[PDB]
């Protein structure tokens, strides 16, 4: 018995979840949405190119005002951009050249970065002395930091390669809550608009919803066959989309607690590096390994456009708060603002 | 263009000037990736989160990075070479070392990156084959069919039955390297110990060859 008896209870519990999942799928979402007009051919053109990076861009985050954006590259530089006039507001040198994530605070007074050094470094921008200085170095993660998002000026949630997620108090520098339950390496992380929940997609082909104020895994989603590289949240806050290495994007619903759409194509073999929604959530933008991004229909599951302006792997993606621009960075050391 | 954003444009131009002056300095150094097992002794190769070491051989800067299955391997896509360290003494983990070397050689992001191979602890495998210890042919069922032992031999003399034990372990990795790759990347094998102090020159001589092949390929001389 012991482990043998406990393994039998897990199989019955797993079968009950699938049985309760099948009882809610009365009709397909693609079947129901086959009554509205398609968006047609979405044609977005490059408006300006942000040049100045000398290595592969791995991360980019929009600011709240939708004019400032911070980009992270392998040259050990954080560059804050004035996207309206192309001007560089700041150039922040980094102690480590290996950054996989970057973040912009909602207030705009702080930026974050992290990577293979397993440290979330937080830089103060609006100081005296006319310079950008590091104000906090958060340590405690074992694996490499894959994502980081600012809850506020004193709270930040990190994704890491130690199969865990963390919540930090920046003033204290301590780990307030540790989120455990995944099997594989956690690659990405998205925050709900109301901040009370967040979702993370890991290398175990699973996505888990977490409660920031409790520390427990509320839901688990398993429909993928490979590593989940990107995750985002539908502006409603009750759905999210995952991008994976199996050349397939999928949309999940929190309340339905099962998969809703599957975005796939026969001529797409490469995986998804980044995902992002639109202001209304009708358009789902995804970045791939074939040097261009694809614009999907989040309700019709049909391709509506391709943004081809990069000659290397698109690594990051970003949509403004007002929806007026889409910024795409890639491994060709350029940033393109599309419209 | 108002008065202030003209001065803000001048601030940006100073930033592009400062961004291009260290990028020239960054282009003068060579980045190396260090990989190996826990018993490989990869720290004791060049006597000089992530651990970064600096060393200079003949006035060119080198950068070696030690981290610590490997999702972060796509970060090291533009490195000059990867330094792989094998415990040639420990015959138990050698098959694991072959499987680990198989993943590095056949990786998607390392299809054009050369690997410098260091068979570490080469003195220790001598006592395992000269004195009374475990049989090498027990773990690998093809050594006793010793083949071409000393097919060509460069040593002043080290009880040449040791040399065939050295050559068989070296040939087990070159056969992996020549299995696939189509000449895009080349594995360079070496035999190293802790007392050896010529490891910095071996990477320098190999990295000179690696850059030479990339230079010869754009002139069609290879």
């Amino acid at each position, epitope marked *: 018995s012991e482990l043998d008896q406990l393994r039998q209870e897990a199989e019955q519990l797993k079968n009950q979840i699938r049985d309760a999942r099948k009882a809610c799928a009365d009709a397909t979402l693609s079947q129901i949405t086959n009554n509205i007009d398609p968006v047609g051919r979405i044609q977005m053109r490059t408006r300006r190119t942000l040049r100045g990076h000398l290595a592969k861009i791995y991360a980019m985050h929009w600011g709240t005002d939708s004019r400032l954006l911070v980009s992270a590259s392998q040259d050990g530089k954080l560059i804050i951009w004035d996207s309206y006039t192309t001007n560089k*507001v700041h150039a922040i040198p980094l102690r480590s050249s290996w950054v996989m994530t970057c973040a912009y605070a909602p207030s705009g007074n702080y930026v974050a970065c992290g990577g293979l050094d397993n440290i979330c470094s937080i830089y103060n921008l609006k100081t005296r*002395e006319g310079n950008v200085r590091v104000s906090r170095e958060l340590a405690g993660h074992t694996g490499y930091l894959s994502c980081c998002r600012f809850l506020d000026d004193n709270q930040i949630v990190t994704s890491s390669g130690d199969t865990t997620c963390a919540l930090w108090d920046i003033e204290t520098g301590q780990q307030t809550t540790t989120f455990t339950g995944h099997t594989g390496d956690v690659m990405s992380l998205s925050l709900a608009p109301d901040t009370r929940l967040f979702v993370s997609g890991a290398c175990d082909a699973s996505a888990k919803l977490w409660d920031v104020r409790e520390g427990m895994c509320r839901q688990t989603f398993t429909g993928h066959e490979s590593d989940i590289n990107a995750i985002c949240f539908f502006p409603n806050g009750n759905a999210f989309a995952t991008g994976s290495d199996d050349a397939t994007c999928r949309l999940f619903d929190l309340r339905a607690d099962q998969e809703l759409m599957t975005y796939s194509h026969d001529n797409i073999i490469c995986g998804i590096t980044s995902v992002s929604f639109s202001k209304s959530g009708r358009l789902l933008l995804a970045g791939y390994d074939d040097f261009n991004c694809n614009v999907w229909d989040a309700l019709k599951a049909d391709r509506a456009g391709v943004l081809a302006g990069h000659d290397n792997r698109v690594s990051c993606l970003g949509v403004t708060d007002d929806g007026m621009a889409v910024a795409t960075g890639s491994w060709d050391s350029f940033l393109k603002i599309w419209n | 263009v*108002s*008065a*202030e954003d003209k001065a*803000a444009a*001048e601030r940006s131009k*100073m930033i592009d000037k400062n961004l291009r002056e260290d990028g020239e300095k960054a282009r003068r150094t060579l980045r190396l990736l260090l990989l190996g097992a826990d018993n490989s002794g990869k720290s004791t190769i060049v006597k000089q989160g992530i651990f970064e070491t600096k060393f200079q051989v003949d006035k060119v800067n080198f950068h070696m990075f030690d981290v610590g299955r490997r999702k972060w391997i796509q970060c090291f896509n533009d490195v000059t070479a990867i330094i792989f360290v094998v415990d040639s003494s420990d015959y138990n983990r050698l098959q694991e070392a072959l499987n680990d070397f198989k993943s590095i050689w056949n990786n998607r992001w390392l299809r054009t990156i050369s690997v410098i191979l260091f068979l570490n602890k080469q003195d220790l495998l001598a006592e395992k084959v000269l004195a009374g210890k475990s049989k090498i042919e027990d773990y690998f069922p093809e050594f006793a069919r010793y083949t071409t032992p000393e097919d060509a031999t460069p040593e002043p003399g080290e009880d040449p039955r040791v040399t065939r034990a050295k050559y068989f372990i070296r040939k087990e990795f070159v056969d992996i390297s020549t299995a696939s790759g189509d000449g895009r990347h080349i594995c360079y094998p070496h035999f190293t110990c802790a007392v050896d102090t010529e490891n910095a020159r071996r990477i320098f001589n190999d990295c000179k060859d690696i850059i030479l092949q990339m230079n010869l390929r754009e002139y069609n001389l290879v």
Partner: single-chain antibody
Amino acid sequence: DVQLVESGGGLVQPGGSRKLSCSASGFAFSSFGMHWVRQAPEKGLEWVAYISSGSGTIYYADTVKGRFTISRDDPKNTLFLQMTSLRSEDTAMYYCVRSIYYYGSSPFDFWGQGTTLTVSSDIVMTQATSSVPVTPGESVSISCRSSKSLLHSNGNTYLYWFLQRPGQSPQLLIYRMSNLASGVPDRFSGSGSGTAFTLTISRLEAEDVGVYYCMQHLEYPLTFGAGTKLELK
């Protein structure tokens, strides 16, 4: 922490020459543009010269062009003002101002003390109010006017507000007509449109008494207002 210590001054015969200096401590002097602002005893606030960060852009006032020279030494953290062929109209106190320029920046934020030097198509800013009696606990509104529309096509209106307390260097209150400076209490506010500006004070108290100045940054030359003095009752 931030300090701008001045040196020089004295009694100079007309036709002589002086070299004022300003030592900067407590901030990154290389990334800041610098400005010289004088203040005559029988006048208000007047702008003299400007040097940019990196010394690539230098502007002078028309009264001092050709005989005044401004320069900076970034490793020494010191900027200079070489003044030649002095006249009686150059008798004033010469303040040094730091200033930075990017998106969301706050130029003219910090002023230093000044040297008392004694010699033996421009936008006009009009401050109609000169002396205003003010009681504590009340709300005082100060209005300024210009000769042009200080709003630009990028959505920016370049109007600044300064407060000169008695025996003190002027201090920035509101930059670009609407945004509050660092360390300034929230009771100060600014609003208006092109050619019509208004600074609002709510629940005025002590240490809020002085001459308020109105300054434009749309186009050099930099022109100040006449000033609006506040007094007790």
